[PDB]
Each structure stands twice: as C-alpha cells, then as structure tokens.
Motif scaffolding. Structure first.
Motif, PDB file in Angstrom:
ATOM      1  N   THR B  57       0.829  -1.200   0.000  1.00 52.05           N
ATOM      2  CA  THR B  57       0.000   0.000   0.000  1.00 52.05           C
ATOM      3  C   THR B  57       0.867   1.256   0.000  1.00 52.05           C
ATOM      4  O   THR B  57       0.587   2.210  -0.729  1.00 52.05           O
ATOM      5  CB  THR B  57      -0.946   0.026   1.217  1.00 52.05           C
ATOM      6  OG1 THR B  57      -1.652  -1.219   1.292  1.00 52.05           O
ATOM      7  CG2 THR B  57      -1.955   1.164   1.105  1.00 52.05           C
ATOM      8  N   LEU B  60       2.351   1.903  -3.445  1.00 50.50           N
ATOM      9  CA  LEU B  60       1.353   2.461  -4.350  1.00 50.50           C
ATOM     10  C   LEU B  60       1.190   3.960  -4.121  1.00 50.50           C
ATOM     11  O   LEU B  60       1.067   4.729  -5.079  1.00 50.50           O
ATOM     12  CB  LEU B  60       0.006   1.757  -4.163  1.00 50.50           C
ATOM     13  CG  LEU B  60      -0.321   0.644  -5.160  1.00 50.50           C
ATOM     14  CD1 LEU B  60      -1.313  -0.340  -4.551  1.00 50.50           C
ATOM     15  CD2 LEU B  60      -0.872   1.232  -6.455  1.00 50.50           C
ATOM     16  N   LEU B  63       4.098   5.852  -5.497  1.00 49.56           N
ATOM     17  CA  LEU B  63       3.997   5.915  -6.951  1.00 49.56           C
ATOM     18  C   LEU B  63       2.986   6.973  -7.380  1.00 49.56           C
ATOM     19  O   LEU B  63       3.204   7.681  -8.366  1.00 49.56           O
ATOM     20  CB  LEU B  63       3.597   4.551  -7.519  1.00 49.56           C
ATOM     21  CG  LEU B  63       4.735   3.563  -7.782  1.00 49.56           C
ATOM     22  CD1 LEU B  63       4.229   2.128  -7.679  1.00 49.56           C
ATOM     23  CD2 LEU B  63       5.363   3.819  -9.148  1.00 49.56           C
ATOM     24  N   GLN B  64       1.962   7.184  -6.687  1.00 48.22           N
ATOM     25  CA  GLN B  64       0.946   8.194  -6.965  1.00 48.22           C
ATOM     26  C   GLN B  64       1.530   9.600  -6.875  1.00 48.22           C
ATOM     27  O   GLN B  64       1.240  10.454  -7.716  1.00 48.22           O
ATOM     28  CB  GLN B  64      -0.232   8.050  -6.001  1.00 48.22           C
ATOM     29  CG  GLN B  64      -1.594   8.107  -6.682  1.00 48.22           C
ATOM     30  CD  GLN B  64      -2.742   7.881  -5.717  1.00 48.22           C
ATOM     31  OE1 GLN B  64      -2.583   7.217  -4.687  1.00 48.22           O
ATOM     32  NE2 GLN B  64      -3.907   8.428  -6.042  1.00 48.22           N
ATOM     33  N   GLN B  67       4.193  10.233  -9.784  1.00 49.45           N
ATOM     34  CA  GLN B  67       3.574  10.442 -11.088  1.00 49.45           C
ATOM     35  C   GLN B  67       2.869  11.793 -11.145  1.00 49.45           C
ATOM     36  O   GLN B  67       2.875  12.456 -12.184  1.00 49.45           O
ATOM     37  CB  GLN B  67       2.586   9.316 -11.400  1.00 49.45           C
ATOM     38  CG  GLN B  67       3.236   7.958 -11.607  1.00 49.45           C
ATOM     39  CD  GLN B  67       2.223   6.855 -11.840  1.00 49.45           C
ATOM     40  OE1 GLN B  67       1.072   6.962 -11.418  1.00 49.45           O
ATOM     41  NE2 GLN B  67       2.648   5.793 -12.517  1.00 49.45           N
ATOM     42  N   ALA B  68       2.299  12.309 -10.094  1.00 51.42           N
ATOM     43  CA  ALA B  68       1.690  13.632  -9.997  1.00 51.42           C
ATOM     44  C   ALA B  68       2.732  14.731 -10.188  1.00 51.42           C
ATOM     45  O   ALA B  68       2.467  15.738 -10.852  1.00 51.42           O
ATOM     46  CB  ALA B  68       0.988  13.799  -8.652  1.00 51.42           C
TER      47      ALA B  68
END
Lengths: 50, 103
Positions: B57, B60, B63-64, B67-68
C-alpha cells in the motif's frame, strides 16, 4: 479480519490511482456525493481545447 | 509464476514444451508453500502477510505522488546540474538517453 481490512485499504489505494491516471479531470469532483456509487460513464470526449 | 502466465497469455507464443516447465514451477511453489506452513505458526504467517500488505500500500502511494509530480513539472524547469556520480542508474538495465522529449 484485520488482514482482509488491510487488503481493502490496498485495493482502495489501487482504485484511487487508477482513477487519477487513467481517467484524466476527476480530482475536483470526488468530495460530496455519499450514496449510490454508480459507475458514471466517463465520456472521454471533453478534454481537448483543440 | 503468475506473471509468467500473464506475459505468455499476452505474447500468444505457445511454445510446445512449456507446460512441463510450468508444472514443475507450480510444484516447486506448492512445496515451498507447504514448507512455509510446516515451519512457521499460522499466527506469524498472517502477521507477515499483514506487513507485506502495508508495504504494498505504501508503495502504491509513493507511486501516486511521484507520477503527480512528473505531470505538474511541465518543462519550465531548468536542468539543475547536480554533481556525484554516486548512483549507477543501472535500475533494471541503464537506458535513459532518450529524453530529447522536447515538447
């Protein structure tokens, strides 16, 4: 129990990711609507100014 | 193992003889999985799975955020020269000559 709840959280996190990156403009509208999560048919058309 | 099944399903190349190897791999996992349940207590295994799940979790989320940050940095940003040649940059390679990515 506890384990399955953690997995649910993980699944939730995965869901948020997929929304943001595959479905471009939606961050603004996530706040209000409580109830019936119906799978709003993401009409792709709008973005391009062009 | 699952990934291998996945890649194959996607690449349609049913090499004849791959099934013997799949079965073996599958058996290998089964033996390992069985060993895990023989060697450790169920309580500890589940605890381990909980932790693995938390880790997964957190990965993830990271990674969010990463990428933002890559989407907001549309290019004004100047090539800051930072220095030490420390990281190999080999990653799964080495690779990234490409960024001509001129707009």
């Amino acid at each position: 129990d506890k384990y399955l709840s953690l997995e649910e959280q993980s699944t939730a996190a995965l869901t948020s990711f997929t929304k943001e990156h595959f479905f471009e403009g939606m961050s603004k509208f996530v706040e209000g609507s409580d109830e019936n999560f119906q799978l709003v048919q993401l009409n792709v058309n709008s973005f391009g100014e062009d | 193992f699952l990934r291998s099944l996945h890649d194959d399903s996607i690449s349609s190349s049913v090499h004849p003889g791959k099934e013997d190897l799949r079965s073996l791999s599958h058996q290998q996992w089964m033996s390992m999985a069985e060993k895990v349940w023989n060697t450790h207590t169920p309580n500890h295994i589940l605890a381990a799975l909980e932790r693995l799940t938390l880790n997964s979790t957190q990965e993830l989320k990271k990674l969010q955020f990463s990428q933002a940050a890559d989407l907001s940095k549309g290019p004004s940003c100047q090539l800051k020269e930072f220095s030490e040649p420390i990281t190999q940059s080999r990653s799964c390679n080495e690779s990234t000559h490409l960024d001509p990515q001129e707009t």
